[PDB]
Amino acid sequence: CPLMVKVLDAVRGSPAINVAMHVFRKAADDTWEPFASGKTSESGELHGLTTEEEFVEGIYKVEIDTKSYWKALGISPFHEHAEVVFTANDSGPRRYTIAALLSPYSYSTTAVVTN
Amino acid sequence: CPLMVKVLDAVRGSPAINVAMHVFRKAADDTWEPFASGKTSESGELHGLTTEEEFVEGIYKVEIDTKSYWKALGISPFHEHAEVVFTANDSGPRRYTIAALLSPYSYSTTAVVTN
Numbered sequence: 475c476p477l478m479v480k481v482l483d484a485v486r487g488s489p490a491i492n493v494a495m496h497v498f499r500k501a502a503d504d505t506w507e508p509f510a511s512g513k514t515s516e517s518g519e520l521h522g523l524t525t526e527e528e529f530v531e532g533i534y535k536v537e538i539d540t541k542s543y544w545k546a547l548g549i550s551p552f553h554e555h556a557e558v559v560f561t562a563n564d565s566g567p568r569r570y571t572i573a574a575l576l577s578p579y580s581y582s583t584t585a586v587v588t589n
Numbered sequence: 590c591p592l593m594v595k596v597l598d599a600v601r602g603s604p605a606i607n608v609a610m611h612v613f614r615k616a617a618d619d620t621w622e623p624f625a626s627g628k629t630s631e632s633g634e635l636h637g638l639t640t641e642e643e644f645v646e647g648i649y650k651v652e653i654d655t656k657s658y659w660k661a662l663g664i665s666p667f668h669e670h671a672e673v674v675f676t677a678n679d680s681g682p683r684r685y686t687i688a689a690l691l692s693p694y695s696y697s698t699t700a701v702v703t704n
């Protein structure tokens with residue numbers, strides 16, 4: 475898959491399992507059109523969101539539902555979600571791994587881009 | 590002022606100066622209504638965004654223009670912007686500092702909420 479997302483929990487030191495996320499793509503009218511969605515596995519990873527053919531050039535937004543994750547662990551978090559917004563495939567196809575590290579009042583995100 | 594934003598640069602080891610950002614408040618129809626905006630100072634801080642009377646409970650989005658910041662420094666960035674989406678909750682007297690640490694392919698954000 476050309477787009478994979480991995481989510482980790484910085485409180486427990488574990489993968490963040492069953493985290494929902496939605497991916498959007500910016501449309502011509504400047505609105506966010508639905509693109510793909512899923513939930514992380516027991517490894518904290520979400521594979522198979524898209525295919526090479528469907529993953530065209532564009533501006534993409536990954537909205538990770540961190541609030542539901544913390545609520546299900548019984549925790550009141552600060553953020554509604556973690557958002558990652560980036561231009562993809564501007565110079566041809568790439569493989570993107572988006573990672574997010576979660577705490578109740580903080581998150582970090584990094585991208586690993588390979589050819 | 591109950592809302593301040595501080596931005597740091599992990600590549601140069603410096604405050605992130607002259608970074609533009611917009612704050613939005615979520616409307617009843619799920620759209621994002623402009624709320625406040627500005628640019629960080631020489632200390633990397635943006636003060637005076639709002640007042641106690643204007644900053645009511647709700648969902649807020651801070652959209653930080655990191656792409657323009659990196660391009661002004663001649664450094665190639667990954668993200669279109671950094672986003673911080675959070676709930677303001679009236680639990681006693683509270684001041685909110687939203688902090689962000691920027692790298693070209695990564696960013697980290699935390700909230701410092703004090704009395």
Ligand SMILES: O=C(O)c1ccc2c(=O)c3c(Cl)cccc3oc2c1
Nearest residue numbers: 480571573574575582583584586695
């Ligand atoms: O792709 C992976 O397996 C992977 C492994 C480690 C990390 C990681 O430590 C990490 C940290 Cl500290 C801060 C922000 C994002 C991160 O994302 C990761 C992703």
Ligand SMILES: O=C(O)c1ccc2c(=O)c3c(Cl)cccc3oc2c1
Nearest residue numbers: 595597686688689690697698699701
């Ligand atoms: O508000 C301040 O003065 C302040 C000081 C230090 C930091 C800081 O190191 C920091 C780090 Cl590593 C990661 C993410 C956010 C951060 O926000 C900060 C904010």
Ligand SMILES: [Ca+2]
Nearest residue numbers: 531563564565
């Ligand atoms: Ca292109």
Ligand SMILES: [Ca+2]
Nearest residue numbers: 646678679680
């Ligand atoms: Ca309340």
